[PDB]
């Protein structure tokens, strides 16, 4: 009644038998842009099923020596399917998301992952270590795509802010003795009603082990983490040639 879930959107369907629940972000479900909030006058295209569907990015391995990974939205879908063509062919973009993270393990495995949504996850750097260099992150760290990027210092989230207060955003846990899926539903969060998908990323998705993975020699040592995500209430406006960046 609460540990089982089927998520159907589009031509896609996820099953889970070992769920917790669904987190609906900031108590707002995704919606479409009202005529009061809108400023642009062009008619937006609303492709219902060709972009609002579950996309599967890649698979990270939870090892003992893991530190964490982050993915930036909507950068993860700007080279993938029909979404990443409407987003390149258009200038404006608006959508929510349903993120769904998968990690399966046995009943003889232990560990926990914090799966959180951090809006406007701006990436800082070590500043040379001494704090004198005003270094900056390259493009393959702020918009790393579907491959994601490995956190160097996950205590401060590579932004000088503590991981411990990160439950103030959306989150779930994947505790392997309780659940193997983490489902968060995110609305469109920005000061503007639409924005560019290639220049601006609305939020980040952190997957950090707070408790480390452990097992005894003989069990399956490959414990994959798979990110699977669906746009929701997508909208595109301002059509011109396809530019990638």
């Amino acid at each position: 009644s609460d540990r089982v879930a089927q998520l159907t959107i589009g031509n896609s369907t996820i099953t889970t038998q070992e769920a917790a629940n669904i987190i609906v972000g900031y108590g707002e479900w995704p919606s479409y842009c009202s005529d009061d909030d809108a400023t642009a006058v062009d008619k937006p295209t609303r492709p219902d099923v060709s972009v609002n569907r579950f996309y599967t990015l890649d698979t990270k391995l939870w090892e003992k020596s893991s530190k964490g990974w982050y993915w930036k939205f909507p950068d993860v879908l700007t080279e993938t399917g029909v979404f990443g063509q409407n987003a390149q062919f258009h200038y404006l973009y608006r959508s929510g998301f349903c993120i769904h993270v998968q990690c399966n393990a046995s009943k003889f495995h232990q560990g926990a992952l914090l799966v959180a949504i951090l809006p406007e996850y701006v990436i800082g750097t070590v500043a040379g270590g001494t704090g004198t260099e005003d270094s900056h992150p390259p493009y393959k760290q702020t918009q790393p795509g579907a491959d994601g990027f490995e956190l160097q210092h996950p205590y401060v989230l590579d932004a000088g802010i503590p991981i411990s207060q990160l439950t103030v955003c959306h989150h779930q846990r994947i505790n392997l003795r309780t659940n193997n899926c983490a489902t968060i539903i995110v609305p469109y969060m920005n000061t503007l009603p639409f924005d560019s998908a290639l220049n601006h990323c609305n939020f980040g998705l952190l997957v950090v082990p707070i408790s480390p993975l452990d097992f005894d020699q003989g069990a399956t040592p490959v414990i994959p983490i798979t990110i699977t995500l669906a746009p929701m209430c997508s909208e595109f406006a301002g059509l011109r040639q396809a530019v990638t960046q």
Binding site: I23, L118, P119, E120, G160, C169, T191, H200, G204, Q245
Partner: protein, 297 residues
């Protein structure tokens, strides 16, 4: 008109935001009710599932035998007005005679309130904040001495010409707003509106403003939002000649009519730069104090 059934039975264009929660009034703290002993099965309010990502809905009425407490403790001082409507240092401008800082008698200050840690860490608790403000300019000599000098505080919005000198043509303030004050007067105090082309300022911007390739040259642009570049503050000694007093202008901003969205983790590391969440990676300090062992104090 709509004919096919998938289009009639469609949720496309549902602009109304469906909210789960509703804001109710809480002028006081919640009162405690009387509780007795519980010795049954099935009803177990102490056990939670924190993996859900929610917080515990357990109260003290269900964990101990409690009395009635009629609370009259007000939640009025935790509002965002009461927390932010408190003037703090956001800027400091030095106008010396000899040196390098500003040896000509004018000074331009790009408006950013992220140069002082005590007001910055208060605003970076949120990612979006919309407010009207009240700026106050406390002018004085290095020693704190009040002297008989006239100044001109010109607001230079973006696009308008910045003054290249004290004798400049931009100082005629025909359309830009200005304030003339003597240092012998009370500090100038003006109210400012919400002046963003957006619906709120934003202290964090995960993105670039410009299209194109992003090489190591134009990596300064990471994080820069032009919706927060509200322009320039300019100050001069009103006169054709050189002043005789050194000067300092200190700027104090008080927010009013505040709205905020999307709380964040609070900064635990020392800031280093303006509009840059960089940190010292070698000298990473823990968020609090430490112990010798976990079984002691």
């Amino acid at each position: 008109g709509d004919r096919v059934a998938d289009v009639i039975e469609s949720s496309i264009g549902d602009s109304v935001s469906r909210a789960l929660t509703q804001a109710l009034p809480a002028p006081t703290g919640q009162n405690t009710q009387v509780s007795s002993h519980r010795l049954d099965t099935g009803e177990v309010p102490a056990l939670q599932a924190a993996e859900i990502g929610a917080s515990s809905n357990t109260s003290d009425e269900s964990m101990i035998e409690t009395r009635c407490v009629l609370n009259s403790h007000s939640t009025a001082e935790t509002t965002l007005d009461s927390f932010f409507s408190r003037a703090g240092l956001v800027g400091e401008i030095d106008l010396p005679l000899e040196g390098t800082t500003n040896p000509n008698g004018y000074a331009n200050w790009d408006i950013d309130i992220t140069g002082y840690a005590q007001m910055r860490r208060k605003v970076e608790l949120f990612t979006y904040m919309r407010f009207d403000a009240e700026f106050t300019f406390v002018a004085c000599t290095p020693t704190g001495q009040v002297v008989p000098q006239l100044l001109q505080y010109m607001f230079v919005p973006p696009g308008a010409p910045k003054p290249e000198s004290r004798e400049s043509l931009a100082w005629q303030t025909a359309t830009n707003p200005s304030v003339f004050v003597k240092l012998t007067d009370p500090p100038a105090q003006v109210s400012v509106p919400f002046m963003s082309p957006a619906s709120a300022y934003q202290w964090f911007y995960d993105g670039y403003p410009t299209f194109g390739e992003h090489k190591q040259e134009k990596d300064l642009e990471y994080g820069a939002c032009p919706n927060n570049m509200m322009g320039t503050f300019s100050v001069r000694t009103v006169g054709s000649s050189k002043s005789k007093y050194p000067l300092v202008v200190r700027i104090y901003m008080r927010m009013k009519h505040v709205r905020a969205w999307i709380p964040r983790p609070m900064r635990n590391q020392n800031y280093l730069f303006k509009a840059n969440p960089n940190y010292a990676g070698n000298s990473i300090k823990p968020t609090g104090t430490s112990r010798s062992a976990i079984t002691t104090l």
